[PDB]
Amino acid sequence: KKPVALIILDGFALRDETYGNAVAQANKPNFDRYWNEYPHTTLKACGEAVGLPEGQMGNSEVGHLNIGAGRIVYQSLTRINIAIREGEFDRNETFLAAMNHVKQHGTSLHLFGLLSDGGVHSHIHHLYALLRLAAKEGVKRVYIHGFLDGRDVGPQTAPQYIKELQEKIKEYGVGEIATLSGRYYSMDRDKRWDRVEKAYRAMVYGEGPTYRDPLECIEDSYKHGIYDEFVLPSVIVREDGRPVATIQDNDAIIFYNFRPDRAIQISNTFTNEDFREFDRGPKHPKHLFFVCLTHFSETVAGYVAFKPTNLDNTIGEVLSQHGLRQLRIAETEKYPHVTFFMSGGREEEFPGEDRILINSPKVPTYDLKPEMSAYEVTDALLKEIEADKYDAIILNYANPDMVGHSGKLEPTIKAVEAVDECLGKVVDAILAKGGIAIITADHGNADEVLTPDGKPQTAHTTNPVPVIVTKKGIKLRDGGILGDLAPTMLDLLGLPQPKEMTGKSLIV
Ligand SMILES: O=C(O)[C@@H](CO)OP(=O)(O)O
Ligand SMILES: [Mn+2]
Ligand SMILES: [Mn+2]
């Protein structure tokens, strides 16, 4: 059994500038020798090359979606942007049905989601659009529950988004900031229900740090070293001390996040008839008209503003169609990406598809444990390899990305070095079994964890990702894109390429 392994170094991209560049500064003997001894190239992992607006940096969802589809996969950010551009956004039956619900039943419209222009999980402009739509539709009570970013944008940039939103509110003549919470709580994806609950109780019970002024809230949190991403779920109150608004029975909610991994948990908390993760309390809200900007999960009992579209014949499906055994493996943080997103937005495994989930460390932030669970993932996978069970493997090492999001150089360097020690063990074990490895990344991040002035850089970058095919005697094209990865693997696998995969094998 000669396995072909797709190894994704999450957040590992190529950048000449070495300042604050953890990828370039890390000692990567393994990665370096493979780059030197095998055919390599780089791929466009951002902008139109991956289905996003030009200039928009990539991410795990976009990257893994494109990597597995073998075609340029059109993304939500782009599609919704166009909807707003073409005057289609205001015509959305779901947005309107939700607005009709509050007016007809005299309830309130709640708007929550990532408050920034990161463009990864949402865009603050989409919120402005909903607000103007709400005003246009004559919806009296509209409340904003903002989730502070700091991960897709500057670590202490909330004030400007809050400031701009307030200005927009005044201008549209509708809306009220009710709560402010760090995406660390309201947008968790690691089933850390303790985090989720904090966000939930602030929004439904007005429990959490209280302020009259949204900006005084952020100021106070900064004062305690707590920045945007980790801001404690707080409540904005009126002059009489009462919360500006809590989510109640028959209210409508429009979750304006278009990325699913970090939206399913809080969405389930609000819509699940029987929720057990934790006790929502007897007076928790029911009969909520819940709207998801895009599809999150079958579990969320709500509606979908922008319906999803099938992604047929992705690598996972082609591999399955030809009777091959495939294994998806990664630790928690990137488990959703190597499965759901890699499978083209599919939850169910394909026949013949095995998945291994290795739990990420129990640390608040990963700069605290840069090697994360890389070694366990590696150990786990090395065993599978000895077993001779899989024809195809899709491995994702989360470290470069996960610890690079801390905006810290030394821990990210360690992160990269840990992954390298691991990368060598895996590629060396695959070559020994006669297989071949495709070493790559889904986008940048670790290549820049410090701003030119040395401040923490906590988000992705727009640089190109590396590509190494451990097969002597071949040449790789140069202007490729992620959507070319699937075709290359199939080529290596000698499996035929489906017409759906409009990508092109990198092998000359
Ligand atoms: O952590 C996340 O949700 C994003 C950043 O907002 O990173 P990635 O796309 O790598 O998952
Ligand atoms: Mn990623
Ligand atoms: Mn990331």
From Swiss-Prot:
Output the HAMAP family linked to this UniProt entry.
GpmI
Record protein name field: 2,3-bisphosphoglycerate-independent phosphoglycerate mutase
Q: Which reaction does it catalyse?
A: (2R)-2-phosphoglycerate = (2R)-3-phosphoglycerate
Cofactors per UniProt?
Mn(2+)
* Top EC class of this enzyme: isomerase
Q: What positions constitute the catalytic site?
A: S60
Residues annotated for Mn(2+) 1 binding in this entry: D401, H405, H460
Consequence of changing D10N: Loss of mutase activity
In terms of temperature, how does the activity behave? Answer: Addition of manganese increases the thermal stability.
GO function term, MF aspect, one: phosphoglycerate mutase activity
Q: Where is the signal peptide?
A: none
Entry keyword set: Glycolysis, Isomerase, Manganese, Metal-binding, Phosphoprotein, Sporulation
Q: What does this protein do?
A: Essential for rapid growth and for sporulation. Catalyzes the interconversion of 2-phosphoglycerate (2-PGA) and 3-phosphoglycerate (3-PGA).
Q: Which family does it belong to?
A: Belongs to the BPG-independent phosphoglycerate mutase family.
Q: Which residues carry this modification: Phosphotyrosine?
A: Y34
Give the activity regulation note: Could be inhibited during sporulation by acidification of the forespore, thus allowing accumulation of the spore's large depot of 3-phosphoglyceric acid.
Species of the source? Geobacillus stearothermophilus
- Mutating S60A: effect? Loss of mutase activity
Lineage here is:
Bacteria, Bacillati, Bacillota, Bacilli, Bacillales
Kindly give the CDD domains that the UniProt entry links to this protein: iPGM
Q: Which GO terms describe its cellular component?
A: cytosol
Its annotated pathway reads: Carbohydrate degradation; glycolysis; pyruvate from D-glyceraldehyde 3-phosphate: step 3/5
Q: What else is known?
A: The pH sensitivity is physiologically relevant, since it allows for the regulation of iPGM activity during different parts of the developmental cycle.
